[PDB]
Design a protein around this ligand. Structure first.
Ligand SMILES: [Zn+2]
Lengths: 74, 315, 76
């Protein structure tokens, strides 16, 4: 299925993912397309952060859902 | 190639980037803009809109060009549409914000006050009292888009755009209406039959499918069902006047919403810019734009999409 | 006066308003008949989205005008 990740940097990333995919796994997909460390990534859905331990289906993330990627540069 | 430039999305502006791709797929709207803009030869929205509308209508000048429409949002949100900073918005609302500024802009022009933009159409409101059979004199009102309630789904049958149009122009009985004729026979209140039909058609038809409804329970409900639209659309059925000119429209762009009733994302299906060899013929290669990302699309993909705003232009 | 409002069904309803009435006044009267909170309403007339804090007069809304009600489908 297809999902959108709205980064705040002017790029809306289109990702092909599975409901079984894990966040850590989605953050990895982001890194491959946009070269951002997964430690710096914060994935948000419906206004709440997604834990690296869960799958997309744990948050009812369906096809053509929209995530928001916030960065944590420290 | 035949790709168009993308649009930077900074802070939840897909509602704008999506609408601009759709607007820039309308040659007539750009032609009216270029003619209208000529009277000024930076808060002239028509000018700032034309700059981005023109760039999106031609192919990308550089490799994988990503344009920035921050100028448009900052002009509108100064006074006209003071929106919260990072708040998601309805692309259809922005369309009517862009229209009201063009109309206000046209009203303040000595040379062009008479020139209507190609999205301008007219509706007819017919009424007749049921108790006294006296017809009301036909009203005429302006529309810049047609907001069609999506009707109830039929069992197994797909929902068509023509079903929506027939539901919009359908007749209906309105209760508790004041009748002058009945009043003098006090203020009698009868029930009339009312019907909307299209009096004038625009060169640029903007259809708005109300994918956001209100449930019986009192909660916002988002209609996800596929509404089946055609590449070619005939509007003779929905006109007021019997006088038979053919009214055929051809699809230029489709604005699609992805999400629930509260938030989501907007993408656009649009045609490619015409070839340099024949720049007055509509291209057949369709494009898919998600803000900055621009990719080739099949006509089947376009028509299989959950349409929200359908942009048509008369042929 | 008496104006009309085409609702989210396409069913038209009768409203009782005055020229001096504000737009949120009209929205609140639609809520009494339709139950949609005014903050979620959008009233379009003659191709113009009416603005709160404005009156039907500022838009020249004459008797038996047809207002169009739509919701707000946000996407960012
Ligand atoms: Zn009567």
């Amino acid at each position: 299925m297809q999902i959108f990740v709205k980064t705040l940097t002017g790029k809306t990333i289109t990702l092909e993912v599975e409901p079984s995919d894990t966040i850590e796994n989605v953050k990895a997909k982001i890194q491959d397309k946009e070269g951002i460390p997964p430690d710096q990534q914060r994935l948000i859905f419906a206004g709440k952060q997604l834990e690296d331990g869960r799958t997309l289906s744990d948050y009812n993330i369906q096809k053509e859902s929209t995530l928001h990627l916030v960065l944590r540069l420290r | 190639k035949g790709l168009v430039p993308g649009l930077v999305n900074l802070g939840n502006t897909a509602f704008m980037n999506s609408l601009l791709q759709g607007l820039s797929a309308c040659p007539a709207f750009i032609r009216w803009l270029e003619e209208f803009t000529s009277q000024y030869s930076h808060q002239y929205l028509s000018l700032t809109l034309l700059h981005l509308l023109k760039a999106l209508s031609c192919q990308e000048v550089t490799d994988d060009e990503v344009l920035d429409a921050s100028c448009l949002l900052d002009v509108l949100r100064m006074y006209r549409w003071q929106i919260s900073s990072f708040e998601e918005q309805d692309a259809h609302e922005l369309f009517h914000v862009i229209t009201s500024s063009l109309e206000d802009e046209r009203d303040g022009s000595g040379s062009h006050w008479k020139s209507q933009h190609p999205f301008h159409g007219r509706l007819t409101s017919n009424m007749v009292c049921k108790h006294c059979e006296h017809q009301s004199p036909v009203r005429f009102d302006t529309f810049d888009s047609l907001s069609l309630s999506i009707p109830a789904a039929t069992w197994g049958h797909p929902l068509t755009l023509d079903h929506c149009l027939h539901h919009f122009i359908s007749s209906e009985s309105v209760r508790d209406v004041v009748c002058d004729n009945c009043t003098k026979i006090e203020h009698q209140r009868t029930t009339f039959v009312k019907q909307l039909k299209l009096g004038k058609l625009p060169q640029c038809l903007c259809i708005h499918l109300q994918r956001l409804s209100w449930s019986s329970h009192g909660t916002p409900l988002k209609r996800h069902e596929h509404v089946q639209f055609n590449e070619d659309l005939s509007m003779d059925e929905y006109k007021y006047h019997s006088n038979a000119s053919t009214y055929l429209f051809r699809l230029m762009a489709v604005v699609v919403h992805h999400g629930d009733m509260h938030s989501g994302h907007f993408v656009t299906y649009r045609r490619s810019p015409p070839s340099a060899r024949n720049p007055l013929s509509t291209s057949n290669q369709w494009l898919w734009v998600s803000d900055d990302t621009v990719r080739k699309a099949s006509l089947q993909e376009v028509l299989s999409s959950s349409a929200y705003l359908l942009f048509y232009e008369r042929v």
